[PDB]
Write a protein that binds this ligand. Structure first.
Ligand SMILES: O=C(O)c1c[nH]c(-c2ccccc2)n1
Length: 144
């Protein structure tokens, strides 16, 4: 199995699924470049390094409330009810929101490590689960 992937058991259904401990992605089916290109949606919380964004001068939501918001956006994106770009534009606490959350291409050595590791472990087109850094909690979409 590719980097980060492990076989797991669903508590709900008792079916096997696969879980990636580097991206936090999970999927039902059984699943390195010099540069990748990613978009993200960042939800900040009261313990972020900078609890402020273009959306809200003072961010007061708890880390747990940020995680519920992230999980509801992942749900909508996976159901096809919303697309990732749309929710990044509206709700991301990063100023990249104005660019549909696009960060452009980057190599290793540039981003916070849990972000970098998640970005380089995703396949093209693949979205992470919740990824925690000192900025807050991210959903990451690898686009190249
Ligand atoms: O204000 C912050 O802490 C912040 C805003 N954006 C980011 C960020 C951008 C790209 C990758 C990881 C974090 N951090």
């Amino acid at each position: 199995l590719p980097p980060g992937w492990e076989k797991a058991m669903s508590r709900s259904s008792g079916r096997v699924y696969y879980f990636n401990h580097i991206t936090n992605a999970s999927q039902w089916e059984r699943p390195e470049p010099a540069r990748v290109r990613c978009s993200h949606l960042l939800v900040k919380h009261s313990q972020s390094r900078r609890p402020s964004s273009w959306r809200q001068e003072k961010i007061t939501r708890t880390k747990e409330e940020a995680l519920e918001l992230i999980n509801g956006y992942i749900q909508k994106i996976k159901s096809g009810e919303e697309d990732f770009e749309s929710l990044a534009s509206q709700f991301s606490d990063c100023s990249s929101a104005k660019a549909r959350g696009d960060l452009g291409a980057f190599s290793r050595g540039q981003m916070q490590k849990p972000f970098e590791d998640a970005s380089f472990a995703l396949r093209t087109g693949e979205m992470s689960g919740p990824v925690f850094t000192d900025s807050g909690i991210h959903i990451i979409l690898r686009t190249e």
